[PDB]
């Protein structure tokens, strides 16, 4: 009886920031909210995250990257997301399978059909009830993120990779607007959050 | 490098059957004949695949979902295939691989109860049409193997789990006998190894063919 909401977008778009904003808006209204993120969300899934992000002189096969992302997702679904939904909680999840389509499909060039096969394999028919896409020019997000220290495997990638990621998110949202809301994350944060405030009534609608 | 066909041999069987011992025995016999061998094992075989092995085998208070276990096994396999197995086959090596996808059917299918069709789907997903040229099944009563063998996640399972493992290997071998050889791993090691000596000419025939 819960509601599954995911947050998506390029690096530095404001996913993590706005996850916490939405959580407070919901919690102050007396709603139980479970916050989580991918890859990760459980101790084992966090170990898989570490493998996915750590640079190595050994190149990771694209299939390995895809399978690890879905292995972490399977564990996270079983351990956190499904139990929260069964409790009737709102789950706010920072990244989910749209990120796999964007990064592994758009970025890595893996066929959409292969990603879809694993989506069905891991999730069955489970999909987010609502996905918020925080869209902006990738360089603006990269500048906000201001990566410091050793870059992780995805931070190592070039602009073409991240542009493909961005465009894949937009393409997927355009094909199923009933499930997606695209926010202009290039707006000042106060304006992005006003946009979120305006979606609140509907979110509650889907929820109840 | 050299561009000739190699041979993909896998070794399978219940816990303590003698897979690892006999992989090394075969390696020594082939190297005595001056044949290039690539030794490897699963899950593992590359730095990343070995980190995945660590997650698969280490006990934890957090239950690992069966789907997670299956996907991790195949993620390690994808990396291993790309990094070690395919290149070895392309340069004409005999790959001697301690466990491969038959173990997935046996442990994740027989043991865990995951549907065979789901494992088959991932097999095709990860391997395309690639299968071992020869799979050696070291078969014996599970209690004998266990009495040979701190325990990892799989070693902690019960006897019915291990019987399912054993029987799954035998079933798969019976269905595709052109690809499998079942050895009686309950014999003394020297007799198991005499059996391996006896099959070496056929192994070499597959390598040359
Ligand atoms: N609309 C915005 N305008 C200006 N700065 C923002 C905006 N959204 C987020 N930021 C800032 O950008 C940085 C990255 O935000 P973050 O939520 O970590 O992004 P993500 O999780 O999408 O990578 C943070 O310092 C955050 O305060
Ligand atoms: N046929 C055999 N008879 C007696 N002992 C054996 C035999 N095969 C292996 N062993 C011993 O049993 C133990 C497990 O062998 P190992 O090769 O590690 O098995 P596996 O890799 O199949 O678990 C080792 O101590 C090994 O020397
Ligand atoms: C969830 C998910 C994340 N990723 C990447 C996006 C990010 O670069 C990284 C996670 O970083 P993040 O926690 O800051 O969002 O993992 C994928 O490539 N595929 C996926 O399915
Ligand atoms: C290769 C593989 C191994 N396993 C298990 C069998 C063993 O208990 C364990 C590997 O340990 P081992 O080195 O002794 O063979 O992994 C699976 O469950 N599925 C697989 O696909
Ligand atoms: Mg973030
Ligand atoms: Mg062994």
Buried b (16+ CB within 10 A) or exposed e, A127-141: ebbbbbbbbbebeeb
Q: Best interface-test mutation with B: which of A43, A68, A80 has the largest number of B CBs within 10 A?
A: A68
Q: Which atom of ligand 4 is nearest to the CA of B101?
A: 21
CA distance linking residue A96 with residue A184, whole number of Å: 20
| CATH number of residue A185's parent domain | 3.40.50.300
B197 CB burial (10 A radius; 0-12, 13-18, 19+) = exposed
CA of A19 to the centre of ligand 3 (A): 15
What residues of B are in contact with residue A119 (Cβ under 8 Å)? Answer: none
What residues of A are in contact with residue B118 (Cβ under 8 Å)? Answer: 121
A85 with A143: CB under 8 angstroms? no
Report which of B145, B127, B124, B119 is spatially closest to residue B12, judged by C-alpha positions: B145
Start-to-end CA distance of chain B, whole Å, equals 21
Where is A37: in which H helix or E strand?
strand A33-37
The angstrom resolution of this structure is 1.3
- Among partner residues B48, B64, B126, which is closest to A58 by beta-carbon distance? B48
Long-range CB pairs of A188-191 (<8 Å, 24+ gap) are A189/A14, A189/A17
Q: How was this model experimentally determined?
A: X-ray
Q: Which atom of ligand 1 is nearest to the CA of A10?
A: 22
For residue A53, what is the nearest residue in chain B, using CA coordinates? Answer: B48
The residue to which tokens 């269905």 are assigned: B175
Q: Do B72 and A71 touch (CB under 8 A)?
A: yes
The residue to which tokens 């494992």 are assigned: B119
- Among partner residues A58, A71, A77, which is closest to B46 by beta-carbon distance? A58
The residue to which tokens 């599970």 are assigned: B142
Cα A127-A131-A133 angle, rounded to 5 deg: 145
Contacts for A121 with CB less than 8 Å, ≥ 6 apart: A70, B67, B118, B121, B122
Beta strand extents in B37-152 (DSSP E only): 37-41, 94-98, 134-139
B10 with B94: CB under 8 angstroms? no
> CB under 6 Å to ligand 2: residues?
B 13, 15-21, 148-149, 185, 187-189, 192
Q: Do the bridges between strand B7-12 and strand B94-98 make them parallel or antiparallel, or are there none, so unpaired?
A: parallel
Which tokens is B47 given? 């730095």
Q: Which atom of ligand 1 is nearest to the CA of A191?
A: 1
CA distance linking residue B174 with residue B191, whole number of Å: 23
**What total of structural domains would you count in chain B?**
1
CA distance linking residue A18 with residue A27, whole number of Å: 14
> Measured between CA atoms, how close is B205 to chain A, in angstroms?
33
Interface of B with A (CB under 8 A): 46-48, 51-52, 55, 60, 62, 64-65, 67-68, 71-72, 74-76, 78-79, 81-83, 118, 121-122, 125-126
Which tokens is B169 given? 């290997």
Q: Do B55 and A70 touch (CB under 8 A)?
A: no
My answer on whether omega of the bond before B43 falls inside 30° of 0, hence cis, is yes
Residue B151: which domain range?
1-209
Q: Which atom of ligand 1 is nearest to the CA of A7?
A: 22
Where is B173: in which H helix or E strand?
helix B159-175
Structure-derived torsion over alpha carbons of residues B152, B68, A84, A49, reported in degrees to the nearest 10: 90
Tally of residues, chain A: 208
Number of A/B CB contacts below 8 angstroms equals 79
CA of B142 to the centre of ligand 4 (A): 15
Q: Is A185 close to ligand 1, i.e. is its CB under 6 Å away?
A: yes
Q: Do A74 and B67 touch (CB under 8 A)?
A: yes
């Amino acid at each position: 009886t819960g509601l599954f909401v995911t947050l998506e977008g390029p690096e530095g778009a404001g996913k993590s920031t706005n996850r916490d904003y939405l959580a407070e808006r919901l919690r102050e209204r007396g709603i139980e909210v479970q916050l989580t993120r991918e890859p990760g969300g459980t101790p084992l899934a966090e170990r898989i995250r570490e493998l996915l992000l750590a640079p190595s002189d050994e190149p990771m096969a694209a299939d390995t990257e895809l399978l690890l992302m879905f292995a972490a997702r399977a564990q996270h679904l079983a351990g956190v997301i499904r139990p929260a939904l069964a409790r009737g909680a709102v789950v706010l999840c920072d990244r989910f399978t749209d990120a796999t389509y964007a990064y592994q499909g758009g970025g890595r060039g893996l066929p959409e059909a292969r990603i879809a096969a694993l989506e069905s394999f891991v999730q069955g028919d489970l999909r987010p009830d609502l996905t918020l896409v925080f869209d902006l020019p990738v360089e603006i997000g990269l500048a906000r993120a201001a990566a410091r220290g050793r870059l992780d495997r995805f931070e190592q990638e070039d602009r073409r990779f991240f542009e493909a990621v961005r465009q894949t998110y937009l393409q997927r949202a355009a094909q199923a607007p009933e499930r997606y809301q695209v926010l202009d994350a290039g707006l000042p944060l106060a304006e992005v959050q006003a946009g979120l405030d305006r979606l609140l009534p509907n979110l509650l609608e889907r929820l109840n």
